[PDB]
Amino acid sequence: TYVISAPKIFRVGASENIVIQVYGYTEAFDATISIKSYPDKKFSYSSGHVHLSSENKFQNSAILTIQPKQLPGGQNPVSYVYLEVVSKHFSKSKRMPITYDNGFLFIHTDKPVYTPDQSVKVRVYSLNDDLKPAKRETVLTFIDPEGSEVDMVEEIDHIGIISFPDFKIPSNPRYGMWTIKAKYKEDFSTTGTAYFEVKEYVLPHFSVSIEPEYNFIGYKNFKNFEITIKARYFYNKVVTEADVYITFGIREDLKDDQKEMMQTAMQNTMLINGIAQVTFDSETAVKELSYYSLEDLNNKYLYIAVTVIESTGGFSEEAEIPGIKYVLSPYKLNLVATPLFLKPGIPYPIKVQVKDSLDQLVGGVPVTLNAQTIDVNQETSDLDPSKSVTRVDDGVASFVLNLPSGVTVLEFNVKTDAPDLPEENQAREGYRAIAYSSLSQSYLYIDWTDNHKALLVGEHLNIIVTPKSPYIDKITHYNYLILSKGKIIHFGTREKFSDASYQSINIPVTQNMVPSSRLLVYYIVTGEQTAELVSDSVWLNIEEKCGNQLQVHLSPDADAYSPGQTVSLNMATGMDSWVALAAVDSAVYGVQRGAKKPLERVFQFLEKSDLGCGAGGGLNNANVFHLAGLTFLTNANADDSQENDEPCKEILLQKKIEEIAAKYKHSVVKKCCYDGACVNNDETCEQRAARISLGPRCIKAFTECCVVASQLRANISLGRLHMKTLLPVSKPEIRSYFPESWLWEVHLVPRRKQLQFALPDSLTTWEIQGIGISNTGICVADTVKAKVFKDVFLEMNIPYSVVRGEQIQLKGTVYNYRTSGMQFCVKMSAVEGICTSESKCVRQKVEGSSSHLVTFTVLPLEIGLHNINFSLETWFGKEILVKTLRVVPEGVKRESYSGVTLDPRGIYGTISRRKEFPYRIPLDLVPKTEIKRILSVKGLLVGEILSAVLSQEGINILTHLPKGSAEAELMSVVPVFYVFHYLETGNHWNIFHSDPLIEKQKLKKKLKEGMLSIMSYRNADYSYSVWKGGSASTWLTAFALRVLGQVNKYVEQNQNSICNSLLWLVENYQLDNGSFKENSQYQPIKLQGTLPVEARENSLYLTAFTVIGIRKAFDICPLVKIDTALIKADNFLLENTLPAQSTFTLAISAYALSLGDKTHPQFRSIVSALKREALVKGNPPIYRFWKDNLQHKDSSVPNTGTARMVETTAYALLTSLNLKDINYVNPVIKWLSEEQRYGGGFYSTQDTINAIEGLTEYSLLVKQLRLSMDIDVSYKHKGALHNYKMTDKNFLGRPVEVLLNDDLIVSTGFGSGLATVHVTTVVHKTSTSEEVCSFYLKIDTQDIYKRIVACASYKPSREESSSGSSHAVMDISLPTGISANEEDLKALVEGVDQLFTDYQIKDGHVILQLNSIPSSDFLCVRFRIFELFEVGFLSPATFTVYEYHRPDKQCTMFYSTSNIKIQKVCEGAACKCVEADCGQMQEELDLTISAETRKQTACKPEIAYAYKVSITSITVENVFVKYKATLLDIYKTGEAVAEKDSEITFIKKVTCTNAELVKGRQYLIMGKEALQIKYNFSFRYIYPLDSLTWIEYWPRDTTCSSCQAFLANLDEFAEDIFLNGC
Amino acid sequence: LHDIRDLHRYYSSESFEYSNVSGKVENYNGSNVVRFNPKDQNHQLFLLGKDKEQYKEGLQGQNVFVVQELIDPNGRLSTVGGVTKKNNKTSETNTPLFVNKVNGEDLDASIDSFLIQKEEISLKELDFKIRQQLVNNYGLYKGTSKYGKIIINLKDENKVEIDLGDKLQFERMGDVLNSKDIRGISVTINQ
Ligand SMILES: *[C@@H]1O[C@H](CO)[C@@H](O[C@@H]2O[C@H](CO)[C@@H](O)[C@H](O)[C@H]2NC(C)=O)[C@H](O)[C@H]1NC(C)=O
Ligand SMILES: *[C@@H]1O[C@H](CO)[C@@H](O)[C@H](O)[C@H]1NC(C)=O
CATH value at residue A524: 2.60.40.1930
- Type and span of the H or E element at A974: helix A967-984
Distance CA A990, CA A905 (A): 25
DSSP A511: G
Helix axis angle, A1143-1153 relative to A1120-1137, nearest 10°?
A: 140
Residue closest via CA to ligand 1's atom 6 equals: A869
Q: How far apart are CA A1082 and CA A966, in angstroms?
A: 12
d(CA A693, CA A702): 12
Q: Whose CA is nearest to atom 26 of ligand 1?
A: A880
Q: Residue A1511: CB partners within 8 Å, gap ≥ 6?
A: A1523, A1524, A1525, A1557, A1558, A1559, A1560, A1561, A1563
Question: Are the C-beta atoms of A909 and A1314 separated by less than 8 Å?
Answer: no
Please state, in angstroms and rounded to a whole number, the distance separating the CA atoms of residues A1248 and A1241.
Answer: 5
**Of A1429, A1450, A1467, which closes a domain?**
A1467
Q: Is the CB of A880 under 6 A from ligand 1?
A: yes
- Contacts by A1162-1169 with C-beta closer than 8 Å and gap 24+? A1162/A1134, A1162/A1135, A1162/A1138, A1163/A1134, A1165/A1138, A1166/A1134, A1166/A1137, A1166/A1138, A1166/A1140, A1167/A1215, A1167/A1219, A1169/A1137, A1169/A1138, A1169/A1140
How many domains, in total, are found in chain A?
13
Q: Which residues contact A864 (CB under 8 A, 6 or more apart)?
A: A886, A887, A888
**Are the beta carbons of A1458 and A1341 closer than 8 angstroms?**
yes
Helix (H) or strand (E) holding A1149: helix A1143-1153
Q: Which residues contact A970 (CB under 8 A, 6 or more apart)?
A: A1014, A1036, A1039, A1040, A1043
- Coil vs helix vs strand at A546: coil
CB A554 within 8 A of CB A767: no
CA of A794 to the centre of ligand 1 (A): 19
- Contact assessment for residue A1074 and residue A1103, using Cβ atoms and an 8 Å cutoff: yes
For chain B, the straight-line distance linking the first and the last C-alpha, in angstroms and rounded, comes to 19
Same domain, B166 and B191: yes
Q: Which helix (H) or strand (E) holds A1338?
A: strand A1335-1338
Read off the DSSP letter of residue A730. T
Same domain assignment for residues B5 and B29: no
Q: For A62-92, b where at least 16 C-beta lie within 10 A, e where not — what string?
A: bbbbbeeeeeeeeeeebeebbbbbebeeeee
Residue of the nearest CA to atom 3 in ligand 1? A869
A494 neighbourhood in chain B, CB within 8 Å: 105-106
DSSP count for chain B of H helices, then E strands: 2, 15
Residues B94 and B177 in one domain: yes
Q: Give the Cα separation of A645 and A631 in Å (integer).
A: 11
Task: Indicate the number of domains in chain B.
Answer: 2
Distance from CA of B159 to the nearest CA of A (A): 13
Residues in Cβ contact with A55 at an 8 Å cutoff, skipping those fewer than 6 apart: A28, B188
Which chain B positions have a beta carbon within 8 Å of A63's beta carbon?
Answer: 96, 111, 184
A884 lines ligand 1 (CB under 6 A): no
- Say how far apart CA A642 and CA A1278 lie, in whole Å: 100
Residues A213 and A261 reside in one and the same domain: yes
Q: Is the peptide bond before B100 cis (omega within 30 degrees of 0)?
A: no
Same-domain check for residues A1576 and A1527: yes
- Domain boundaries, position B55: 13-86
Q: Which residues of A1499-1519 are buried (b: 16+ CB within 10 A; e: fewer)?
A: bebbbbbbbbbbbebbeeeee
Chain A residues touching residue B143 (CB < 8 angstroms): none
Check: CB of residue A257 under 8 Å from CB of residue A322.
no
Q: What CATH number is given to the structural domain containing A379?
A: 2.60.40.10
Bridge-based pairing of strands A733-734 and A200-201 is parallel
β-bridge partners, A251 = A301
Identify whether residues A565 and A637 lie together within a single domain: no
Same domain, B79 and B92: no
Q: A1357 CB less than 6 Å from ligand 1? A: no
Q: Is the distance from CB of B146 to CB of B7 less than 8 angstroms?
A: yes
**Residue A1447 belongs to domain with CATH number:** 2.60.40.690
Q: Please say whether the beta carbons of A1025 and A1397 come within 8 A.
A: no
Give dist(CA A776, CA A1426) in Å, integer: 63
Pairing of strands A801-803, A886-888: parallel
Q: How many CA atoms lie within 13 A of A1471 on its CB side?
A: 8
Q: What are the residues whose beta carbons fall under 8 Å from the beta carbon of B111, sequence distance 6 or more?
A: A17, A19, A61, A63, A488, A489, A490, B96, B97, B98, B99
Closest CA to A556 of A816, A400, A338, A787: A787
Residue type at position A348: Y
Calculate how close chain B gets to A491, using CA atoms only, in Å.
5
- Helix or strand (DSSP H, E) at A1612: helix A1607-1620
Whether B57 and chain A come into contact, CB under 8 Å, resolves to no
Q: Provide the residue range defining the domain that includes A182.
A: 104-202
Cα–Cα distances in angstroms (integers) from residue A1543 to residues A1504, A1523, A1557, A1594, A1596, in the given order: 17, 11, 16, 18, 20
B102 & B167 share domain: yes
> Could you tell me if B136 and B71 lie in one domain?
no
Contact indicator for A1004, A955 with CB cutoff of 8 Å = no
Nearest alpha carbon to residue A367 among A398, A404, A326: A398
A1002: enclosing H helix or E strand = helix A996-1012
Give the dihedral sign, CA A1418/A1422/A1428/A1430: positive
Tell me how close the Cα of A448 comes to any Cα of chain B, in angstroms: 18
As a whole number of angstroms, the distance between CA A70 and CA A79 comes to 10
Choose one of A791, A812, A839: the last residue of a domain: A791
In angstroms, the CA A1453 to CA A1437 distance is: 9
Contact B107 A56 (CB under 8 A): yes
Let me know whether B73 and B121 are in one domain: no
Residues B60, B41: Cα–Cα separation, whole Å: 20
Q: Any bridge partners for residue A594, and if so which?
A: none
The sign one gets for the Cα dihedral B63, B69, B75, B76 is negative
CB contact under 8 A, B137 and A510: yes
Cβ–ligand 1 distance for A869 under 6 Å, the answer: yes
Nearest to A1104 by CA among A1032, A1067, A1154: A1154
The answer on B184 and B156 residing in a single domain is yes
A544 touches A777 (CB < 8 A): no
B164/B91 same-domain check: yes
* A30 and A45 belong to one structural domain: yes
Sign of the alpha-carbon dihedral angle for A854, A859, A864, A870: negative
The three-class DSSP label of residue A1478 is coil
- Identify which of A1169, A1176, A1163 has the alpha carbon closest to the alpha carbon of residue A1190: A1169
| Cα A1113 to Cα A551: distance, rounded to the nearest angstrom | 55
A911 CB less than 6 Å from ligand 1?
A: no
Query: Closest-CA residue in chain A for B111?
Result: A489
Chain A residues in contact with B188 (beta carbon < 8 A): 55-56
Residue A1061: which of A1133, A1102, A1005, A1117 has the closest Cα?
Answer: A1117
Q: Residue A1298: which CATH number?
A: 2.60.120.1540
**Residue A469 Rama label (left phi>0; alpha psi -120 to 50; beta):** left
The CA–CA distances, whole Å, from A393 to A344, A354, A363, A427 equal: 31, 12, 7, 20
Q: Answer for the pair A491, A510: CB distance below 8 angstroms, yes or no.
A: no
Are residue A1074 and residue A1217 in the same domain, yes or no?
yes
A1353 neighbors A1413 (Cβ within 8 angstroms): yes
Last residue of a domain, one of B60, B86, B112: B86
Which residue type does A1010 have?
G
Q: From A882, A883, A884, A885, give the residue whose CB has the most ligand 1 atoms within 8 Å, as the site to mutate.
A: A882
Cα separation, A160 vs B124, in Å, equals 30
Where among A370, A405, A438 does a domain terminate?
A438
CA angle A710, A712, A718 (to 5 degrees): 95
Q: How far is the CA of A807 from the centre of ligand 1 (A)?
A: 26
For residue B115, list chain A residues with Cβ-Cβ distance below 8 A: 775
Asked whether the beta carbons of residue A494 and residue B106 sit closer than 8 angstroms, the reply is yes
Which residues are CB-neighbours of A1520 under 8 A, at least 6 positions away? none
* Residue A1097: its H or E element: helix A1091-1113
What per-residue string of b and e applies to A961-998 under the rule 16 or more CB within 10 Å gives b?
bbbbbbbbbbbbbbbbbbbbbbbeeeebeebeeeeeee
Give the C-alpha separation, A601 to A780, whole Å.
10
CA gap A365, A387 in Å, rounded? 10
- Write down which residue in B68, B86, B104 finishes a domain: B86
Q: How far apart are CA A515 and CA A140, in angstroms?
A: 28
Judge contact between A125 and A209, C-beta under 8 A: no
Residues of A engaging B, defined by a Cβ cutoff of 8 Å: 15, 17, 19, 49, 55-57, 59-61, 63, 130, 132, 477, 488-495, 507-508, 510-512, 775
Q: Are residues B7 and B34 in the same domain?
A: no
**Nearest-angstrom CA–CA distance, A988 and A1005:** 19
Q: How many CB atoms lie within 10 A of CB A22?
A: 20
Contact by Cβ (8 Å): A476, A492: no
A555 and A580 assigned to the same domain? yes
A882 lines ligand 1 (CB under 6 A): yes
Residues A668 and A806 placed together within one structural domain of the fold: no
Asked if A661 and A550 sit in the same domain, the reply is no
Based on the domain organization, do A1321 and A1334 belong to the same domain? Answer: no
- A238 within 8 A of A308, measured Cβ to Cβ: no
Residues of A in contact with B154 (CB under 8 A): none
Nearest to A478 by CA among B112, B98, B107: B107
What distances in angstroms separate CA A1427 from CA A311, A887, A1136, A1432, one per listed residue?
15, 19, 58, 12
Q: Tell me the sheet residues that pair with A331.
A: A356
Contacts of A111 (CB under 8 A, 6+ apart): A121, A196, A584, A585, A588, A738, A741
SS3 A621: helix
> Beta partners for A247?
A305
Ligand number, closest to the Cα atom of A715:
2
Using CA of residue A989, residue A991, residue A992, residue A993, what is the dihedral sign?
positive
Q: Identify the nearest ligand to the CA of A879 by its number.
A: 1
Q: CB-CB: which of A15, A55, A492 is closest to B109?
A: A492
- Among A478, A470, A486, residue whose Cα is nearest residue A520: A478
Would you say A123 and A134 are in contact if contact means Cβ atoms under 8 Å apart? no
Cα separation, A772 vs A778, whole angstroms: 6
Q: What is the 3-state secondary structure (H, E, C) of A1073-1092?
A: CCCECCCCCCCCCCCECCHH
> Amino acid letter at A941?
L
What's the reported resolution, in angstroms, to a tenth? Answer: 3.6
Cβ neighbors of A1585 (< 8 A, separation 6 or more) are A1478, A1479, A1546, A1547, A1548, A1567, A1591
> For residues A1398 and A1389, is the Cβ–Cβ distance under 8 A?
yes
What is the Cα–Cα distance from A1082 to A1412, expressed in whole angstroms?
8
Tell me which DSSP letter residue A661 carries: G
Cα–Cα nearest to A1213, from A1188, A1234, A1185: A1185
| Strand B62-64 relative to strand B83-84, pairing | antiparallel
In DSSP terms, A748 is beta-bridged to A578
A1177 Cβ contact list (under 8 Å, min separation 6)? A1183, A1184, A1227, A1231
Q: Are B51 and B115 found together in one domain? A: no
Which of the listed residues B86, B104, B127 is the one where a domain comes to its end?
B86
User: Same domain for A417 and A314?
Assistant: no
A1198 shares its domain with A1228? yes
Instruction: For residue B163, give the CATH number of its domain.
Output: 3.10.20.120
- 3-class DSSP state for residue A373? strand
Q: From residue A1469, how far is each of A351, A1325, A1473 by CA, in Å?
A: 90, 19, 7
Q: Could you tell me the sign of the dihedral formed by the alpha carbons of A909, A913, A916, A917, in that order? A: positive
CB A1549 within 8 A of CB A1523: no
Beta bridge partners of A107: A124
- Intra-chain end-to-end CA distance of chain A, in Å: 93
Task: Find all residues with CB under 8 Å of A727, minimum gap 6, and list them.
Answer: A247, A261, A674
Residues 6+ apart with CB under 8 A from A399: A349, A350, A351, A352, A369, A386, A388
Summarize chain B as % helix, strand, coil (round to 5).
Answer: 15, 30, 55
Residue A1171 has phi, psi (to 5 degrees) of: -70, -20
Question: Cβ B184–A495 below 8 Å, yes or no?
Answer: no
CATH code for the domain in which residue B64 is found: 2.40.50.110
Return the best residue to mutate from A869, A879, A880 for the ligand 1 pocket (most ligand atoms within 8 A of CB): A869
Are residues A574 and A751 in contact, defined by beta-carbon separation less than 8 angstroms?
A: yes
CA atoms within 13 A on the CB side of A763: 9
Q: Assess whether A1027 and A1143 both reside in one domain.
A: yes
Q: Which amino acid is at B146?
A: K
Q: Which of A60, A493, A775 sits opposite B115 (nearest CB)?
A: A775
Q: How many Å apart are CA A1104 and CA A1148, to the nearest integer? A: 6
Nearest of A1410, A1604, A1385, A1584 to residue A1503 by alpha carbon:
A1584
Residue A51 one-letter amino acid: H
Q: What is the dihedral of CA A758, A760, A765, A768, to 10 degrees?
A: -60
C-alpha pair distances (Å), A606 with each of A281, A596, A599, A1405, B169? 43, 16, 11, 53, 43
* DSSP-assigned beta bridge partners for residue A1455: A1437
Count of C-beta atoms within a 10 Å radius of residue A1274:
18
Is the beta carbon of A560 within 6 A of some atom in ligand 1? no
For residue A325, give the nearest of A304, A353, A354, A307 by alpha carbon.
Answer: A304
Residues B65 and B148 occupy one common structural domain: no
Helix (H) or strand (E) run with residue A63 in it? strand A59-64
